[PDB]
Design a protein around this ligand. Structure first.
Ligand SMILES: [Mn+2]
Ligand SMILES: [Mn+2]
Ligand SMILES: [Mn+2]
Length: 425
DNA sequence: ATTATGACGCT
């Protein structure tokens, strides 16, 4: 009882830009704002592949990883913005730069861990403590939480419900106890309101957020109320939330491991996990997964918010599907050069912005008819930021995959170059 | 013929 630690030591937030690429294009092109619109890559094959969808377009059924011609069938007024094309491939520079704008604002409040181009985690523990002392006993007004939902409330129109739940939460709050996890989460959500207001003020981009005691709960919370809303998931709300939460909705259980949790244990929802001992879980899923599952189904996870705002690897990738697969030597060389030229541009920009050089080049290929997504991955040294040298080395390192007797066989359906192992400059 | 990435575990 008194010695069962409840994983309530931390305040952790997950901030996620709503349909991020679409917002970047909507800021640039006002004629897209407040409309069904999506962002695509390429346009010849079925109108191109959609990778981001505005909420108005989502209400028609338009989803990511859908062909544009198909989405137009669901949403005939759909508007489309196209990813930039450079050297024959998609170039995502506009979005990496918008992402960095957002990250630099978030970093003014706390230390953040960039988790993807559009989302980061925040460790607010110190910030909440500082603020809690700044109030010196003053209660938290609902006015300070204008977009916050309290998960599990009310109990016993949408904005009316939100306000009722916030009112129940605040009325039941003990503002005098500077050590109550619920008060701490609450101050964290106030700071997250301020972070999101600064982001919208200074970039125009809207975002959702989750506020909880760890990364998995913060991430799960962020998704409960989108777009443009933030959700507080308290420790106390976990048993009811998890009691109907499909296992697959938890971060890292959406694929094969979650499928086998479901199949092996004979269960559907996160909460059923609590009925197993740690040893049973470890026996089925290994010692690490076992401990992690045993704590997670009770709302507890210790994965830290890493202080890492910049990517650890810088990569360039192009698929060559169907009949576009690269079948000759000249083709493989030209596309390796195009990839290495974009990689060189991004790496030089990186070294100048962030004072660091990569030291290792990773070359990855898929061959046609190969089941795997990486038919080969081989590393070599990266000593100078020169696109010709890097493409020549990537060739030197992949060339023994050709089984021709000028030709290339099996034809290549993917090239990939990744600069890694960064060291300060 | 979702594609372009990027983190992280396993051995
Ligand atoms: Mn997002
Ligand atoms: Mn998405
Ligand atoms: Mn995201």
């Amino acid at each position: 009882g008194p010695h069962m630690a409840t994983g309530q030591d931390r305040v952790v937030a997950l901030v996620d830009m709503d349909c991020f690429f679409v917002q970047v294009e909507q800021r640039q092109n006002p004629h897209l704002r407040n409309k069904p619109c999506a962002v695509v890559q390429y346009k010849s094959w079925k109108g191109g592949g959609i990778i981001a969808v505005s909420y108005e377009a989502r209400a028609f059924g338009v989803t990511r990883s859908m062909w544009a011609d198909d989405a137009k069938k669901l949403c005939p007024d759909l508007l489309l913005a196209q990813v930039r094309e450079s050297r024959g491939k998609a170039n995502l520079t506009k979005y990496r730069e918008a992402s960095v704008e957002v990250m630099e604002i978030m970093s003014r409040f706390a230390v953040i861990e960039r988790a993807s181009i559009d989302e980061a985690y925040v460790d607010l523990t110190s910030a909440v403590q500082e603020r809690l002392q700044k109030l010196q006993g003053q209660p938290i007004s609902a006015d300070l939480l204008p977009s916050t939902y309290i998960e599990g409330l009310p109990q016993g129109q949408k904005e009316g419900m939100r306000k009722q739940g916030l009112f129940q939460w605040l009325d039941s709050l003990q503002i005098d106890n500077l050590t109550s996890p619920d008060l701490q989460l609450t101050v964290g959500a106030v700071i997250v309101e301020e972070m999101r207001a600064a982001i919208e003020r200074e970039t125009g981009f809207q975002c959702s957020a989750g506020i909880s005691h760890n990364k998995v709960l913060a991430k799960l919370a962020c998704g409960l109320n989108k777009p443009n809303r933030q959700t507080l998931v308290s420790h106390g709300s976990v048993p009811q939330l998890f009691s109907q939460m499909p296992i697959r909705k938890i971060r890292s259980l959406g694929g094969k491991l979650g499928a086998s949790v479901i199949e092996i244990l004979g269960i559907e929802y996160m909460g059923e996990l609590t009925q197993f001992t740690e040893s049973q879980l470890q026996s089925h899923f290994g010692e690490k997964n076992g401990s992690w599952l045993y704590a997670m189904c009770r709302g507890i996870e210790h994965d830290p918010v890493k202080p890492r705002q910049l990517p650890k690897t810088i990569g360039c990738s192009k698929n060559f599907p169907g009949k576009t697969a690269l079948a000759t030597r000249e083709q493989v060389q030209w596309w390796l050069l195009q990839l290495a030229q974009e990689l060189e541009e991004r790496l030089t920009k990186d070294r100048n912005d962030n004072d660091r050089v990569a030291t290792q080049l990773v070359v990855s290929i898929r061959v046609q008819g190969d089941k795997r997504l990486s038919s080969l991955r081989r590393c070599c040294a990266l000593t100078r930021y020169d696109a010709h040298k890097m493409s020549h080395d990537a060739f030197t390192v992949i060339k023994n995959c050709n089984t021709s007797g000028t030709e290339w066989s099996p034809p290549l359906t993917m090239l990939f170059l990744c600069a890694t192992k960064f060291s300060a400059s």
